[PDB]
């Protein structure tokens, strides 16, 4: 808490200001994206409130990852269709292993018995191996030659499913009210302003201070949206089971395979340019081996002290591979 | 049963007038394959009495995807061997997710405790990654630039291999008798003489409604083939335990990958044209995807509502992007 | 025992007075190989006898691969990196399905019940999959193009991580003595001293009797290297409880994975030379592969007849495979 306080506070004048004084722009990307982690440590917060408070599903669906949605609306009209692929990619990435990593290594205190062995395999994985490996891979793989016109039906058909599941299977399935009435204006607003900003920036930090621009959207911009959002996970730990902490990893990620993407490729439609569920090999690669990693160490639990190292290694390997590029 | 006797009685002298009247080719193909389907529909039953009536695990495995091994027979005199490789990629598909996801959604009225853990993952597990990513990914990978002469004596070597593992496990490991009689002539040669038809059929379809000639084998040619006849599985439901039911797709699958194939494969030899074990890149991407899938599923059971519903679109996907191609 | 005493004793002159000789080249090569099997035999039952008398497992990590270790540190010098590479595949695809393999199927005398179900699953396939799957494969995709100077960064980023994890965690984590000291002088000098012979070998051999290059180091200077010394394995059955048995190949494999090449890699560092994680796509999808039969199979267990069977049938295929490209 403390230390967000400090961060939200210092960081939306110096922003507003920031975009007032127009440069150099490579500081203030840096300024404007250091208040979103708080901001998103907030949206958070928020949405867990509201949805503490059936239906309060899709504000945690919706709400939960609305800084990735939101960041990446702008990105889609000013789209740099691009850099909204590479972040949904970093969503993924973020929540294996860096949040369900640091959760797992840092709550590595003493080990927790095994847990939750009957639960996890029948519906995180399923979905889990299902949502990310047809959503994502079909799409690259049949895409190859196709082409253009085609690309976007197979998404289209794909993310309208994948939707039309997802309601169908979730309509099927501290300190709040308060907290869910300002998150809106503190940071819906904030965040969206701040969000305008951010685009414009990255061409310039790219050509300035490369490599390089999916390196953005992979890595920097996801830490922002999704993990800081999410990261609420590793926190409880002991003190509470860490059942929810994985559930709060995969369902966030799910969620985001399942409908910030496919809505997001939706939308896509609206404005003139549209993008198809196209990823690079090393982006895919990288998705399919932390569903393996999640699956394998998924199988028994609980958890272990480097169980999150492990995990943690492998997320910083992909980060420096994804700089590398 | 009602309907499966109206579509044989009426099918037949409709194909066999059909192969008289010789045009137009579009509209009896299609004529041509909805007979089959019932014709493939009794095929598995006249087999399941059988097998209930050893050595009977062989007629299982021959005879029934004999229309699988029968249509993909005389594709490979005209081979014409691409529809025959897209046609095995299509049996894998078929019975998972298709048949299986279908039994599993259809069944889907009360879930049903949490059954067989203990049995599947030792057994059907093991060869189905096996055998698939060994019998098909293998080939496709090594035999990128080898070239031709080397391509088949690999498929050689594994074919061999696949049955004399195959039949060296095998042999280690309601209403019948007639239904065992009148099989042959009621199938056997009328598929057979519906057979001949279909090949010449396709290029004219293919170039008058595409796309594509894949596709054709890979989604329609494998409904008709080895759906129809698996779909035997959907049916016991509730009514009795699902375990034949996920032993019916699997065992007929791993049948398909450990034997259709290899057989068909050492058939090629004895007519000039030769086809090795060489998949597409999308053929190969989506059964892979299949084995996960399962496997995913396949941990705890013993299913769910939507345990088939994720399944069948899954399929679905995948038959719009084969389309797409 | 008595074939070992046979090898050692005729291998050793044969193979100075070939060096001696100095033709044909062939056969010699032919001889040498021959040798270190036996070699490498004793150099596993050495360092075996070390680790029964905490640190000890920097010996079994060490010195229970030093044939391997030893035989890619002369083909860096003079590399020849390619070898270096193609032998580290051979490693995994050695220890699975060969060594793990021969082990199932001999001890497959009866079936003895189902074991060791609760150990495997937590810690052998997770860094097994995080292990192969990031280690390899990561570099292999990630390094298309980079190009040179990021390969090697990557791989060094890479190498430490896995290294400083590997000691991170292995740190927290019959008649001895006699073989403890004798085995220096018989073997890691002895196989030093052929290993000088070897590299300047295959070159003409490659030549002469084809293909490949890749081959060499794919199957034959695996089988030498890694298997013999592990082929300990295969012994223990039933005799002893196989719980070791899966111990040996898949931790010998780990240590491969995370410590054999890491630090080979860093070696390449020194001289002029310089190996990044390259691999091929044949070798990566080979690798993986036994990935996911060693954790299909490691499920349930414990064993069956034809549980090493498939095992040995998936990898007499890859090496056929290798040998035709």
Redesign the interface.
Known sequence: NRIFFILVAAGVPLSVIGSLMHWPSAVLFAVYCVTIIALASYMGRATESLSIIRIGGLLNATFGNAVELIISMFALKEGLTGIVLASLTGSVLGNLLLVAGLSFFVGGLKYAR?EFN?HD??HN??????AI??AF??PE??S?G?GNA?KL??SI??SI??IL?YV??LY?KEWSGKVATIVLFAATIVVAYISENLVHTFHSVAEQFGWSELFIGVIIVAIVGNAAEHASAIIMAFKNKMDIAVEIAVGSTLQIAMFVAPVLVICSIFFPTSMPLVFT??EL??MV?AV??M???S???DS????G??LL??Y???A???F??
Chains 1, 2, 3 share one sequence.
């Open positions: 095994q009957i395999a029948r994985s399923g979905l889990l191996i299902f490996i047809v891979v079909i793989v049949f190859v196709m085609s039906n197979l058909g794909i499913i994948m599941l169908a299977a099927f090999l090393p690669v990288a081996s393996l990693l699956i394998a160490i199988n028994d639990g272990n002290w480097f169980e190292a492990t290694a492998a910083v390997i992909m420096i591979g994804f590398l590029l």
